[PDB]
Design a protein around this ligand. Structure first.
Ligand SMILES: [Cl-]
Ligand SMILES: [Zn+2]
Ligand SMILES: [Zn+2]
Lengths: 382, 383
């Protein structure tokens, strides 16, 4: 039942409900032998999950002589802790324990994008490289963030500017984290999930359209204490989620496909650079996919009915589909993205623009990002 | 130009005058880019940077769009080898207009300090950018620049944060030696001799022979315009590239064969223990010289190495101006006495039984890996 997915050779992705409680601690010891296991997380995420883990650790760690140790570090929440100085606070922290954390260390990244990127990057340079595993707590991190080996930190001049490609030895996808993942954060992650489906399998996109109501009903429902948020749809949820992560993994193992993973992001990033941090990545990318789908329709590449499904499906999962979206409006206080600013932020990444184009749901136009004229792009921005 | 392959491809280019007539041009043709970032310390840069800027536009003007050259001069000393300096160089590259992209090609002009810092900056700049090695010191020509090891120092220790990032190119301009402070040269010869003594009794003999000559050149005062090493250019070239060539071969010998890479620590087991105590008054090569001597005595002590061999190690090291005992007057003075107790030494080593690289004969290692040796036996050579 512990669904395993491979990436770049061996299977590092292990997805199932309850891994954090009954499988992680044990697996680390048996597959990631070491004397030191360093866990990184933010105070909030750690005050909730770290406790049950410390216990699951000694349990399975005591059957060994000498017994390995567990050192824990709680960084402040927010994308604040994703900086040159926190990376340093951690490094110096590990280097200070007695005995100092050596090269056998195994770093645990318990958290979302912020925790994953920072933690992943720390291990990549700690004594020129040490093993580490990923335990994404957020949906977005589960299907996109954790997978790929991309790690980095942010600077006053921009996001993810300093970092390295360091693959995680393991990627534990505990779908039980979703049971308590703030609603908004869930809807947020579903943007990439839908993104993946729409660029690879019209049948998977269809299953998303079908399960939308159900999944979203569970996500929003008032869960009675002692009951599992996703009772009855465990398999549905599992399927729809792992399907996205599985595709991400397949692209990583393979610049054609990878480029297709930026569908909606061309315009999405332009939107996000303006609306962040009030509006989240997934939310922007949702609007981004919509616009980029309209462009394909504009070039006569994509058919309208397809554009409708993208929009309907995205909305069915609580995602916004236009900058006119009220929620957005209220959250940004009237922050307005102009066609000029949008076009400016897109070229911030020349005379043309490389936009991922779809000819049909689940079927890309080219096996790469297409080249589209600016004037044609300035038509789908408003 | 002579060329040595390291890890499949061949990135080591060694010859006299590369910095002036070959580097700038080669970068453009083999490392196509719009941005070329040069890193060095003020001193090294005030001397060689100038002639390069010129060599650059020259060969850069023949390409359109002609690539740019951004220069960064970090303060000398192993001081600039820190988290902070790495950050600055990064923000400085992120603050250029246009900012330095992923096509950037970083130039590391300097020695160990410049090489390690620069190499490590490129490894992480936007998750990785290309770079080249222009080792200014002998130590950095035959050992530092080759291997892909990059890092910085922290208040808790040396090279603790870093990454393995291979340089796209390694330009060995043997003309840098013409002006490399004497002490620094003798210093680098420690690794050169180290390499020979652990791989080719034949090569080790050449070092012994050219010893006087080479050392005579290094010390002679060169009349303006003349080449410090006139008449021995080929001799010098052979002896030096021979070491770098071996370093390259060890780097290339892939797989879990950390046996050969282990032999590259001959003299360093005890050498590092000495250095942790005498630095920064005494240099790495100097300590490793005493270290090889000690580690050679140990092999003799275990009956592994023959005396005549040990004597040669000592004679050869000395023939090249290197110290052979902590009693060596020059050491003694620079460290103002400062004693290295057999205790601190065994502690500094533990700080890393004990595994030492043992030789059974000059140019012939005992095991194809570092051997395991009892502490009491190691302490008897530190007495
Ligand atoms: Cl860093
Ligand atoms: Zn994304
Ligand atoms: Zn050395």
């Amino acid at each position: 039942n512990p669904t395993k997915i491979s990436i770049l050779g061996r299977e590092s992705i292990i997805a199932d409900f309850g891994l954090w409680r009954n499988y992680v601690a044990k697996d680390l010891i048996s597959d990631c032998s070491s004397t030191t296991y360093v866990l990184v997380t933010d105070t909030n995420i750690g005050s909730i999950y770290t406790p049950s883990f410390e216990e699951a650790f000694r349990k399975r760690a005591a059957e060994i002589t000498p017994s390995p140790r567990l050192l824990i570090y709680n960084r402040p929440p927010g994308e604040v802790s994703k900086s040159r100085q926190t990376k340093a606070d951690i490094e110096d922290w590990m280097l200070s324990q007695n005995p100092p954390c050596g090269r056998d260390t195994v770093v645990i990244a318990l958290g979302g994008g912020v925790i994953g990127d920072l933690t992943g990057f720390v291990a990549s340079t700690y004594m020129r490289g040490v093993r580490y595993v990923q335990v994404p707590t957020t949906l977005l991190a589960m299907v996109d963030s954790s997978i790929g080996g991309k790690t980095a930190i942010d600077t006053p001049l921009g996001k993810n500017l300093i970092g390295a490609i360091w693959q995680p030895t393991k990627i534990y996808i505990d779908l039980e984290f979703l049971e308590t993942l703030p609603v908004r954060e869930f809807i947020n992650g579903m943007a990439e999930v839908i993104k993946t489906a729409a660029i690879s399998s019209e049948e998977e996109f269809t299953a998303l359209e079908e399960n939308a109501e159900t999944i979203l009903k569970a996500v929003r429902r008032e869960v009675t204490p002692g009951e599992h948020r996703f009772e009855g749809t465990e398999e549905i949820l599992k399927a729809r989620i792992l399907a996205s992560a599985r595709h991400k993994a397949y692209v990583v193992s393979a610049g054609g496909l990878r480029n297709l993973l930026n569908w909606g992001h061309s315009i999405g990033h332009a939107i996000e650079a303006i609306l962040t941090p009030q509006i989240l990545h997934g939310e922007c990318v949702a609007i981004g996919m919509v616009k980029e789908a309209e462009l394909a329709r504009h070039l006569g590449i994509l058919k309208g009915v397809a554009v409708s499904r993208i929009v309907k499906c995205l909305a069915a999962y609580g995602l916004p589909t236009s900058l006119k979206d009220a929620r957005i409006r209220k959250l940004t206080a009237g922050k307005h993205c102009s066609v000029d600013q949008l076009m400016f932020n897109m070229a911030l990444d020349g005379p043309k623009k490389k936009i991922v184009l779809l000819s049909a749901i689940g079927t890309p136009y080219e096996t790469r990002a297409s080249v589209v004229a600016n004037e044609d792009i300035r038509v789908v921005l408003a």
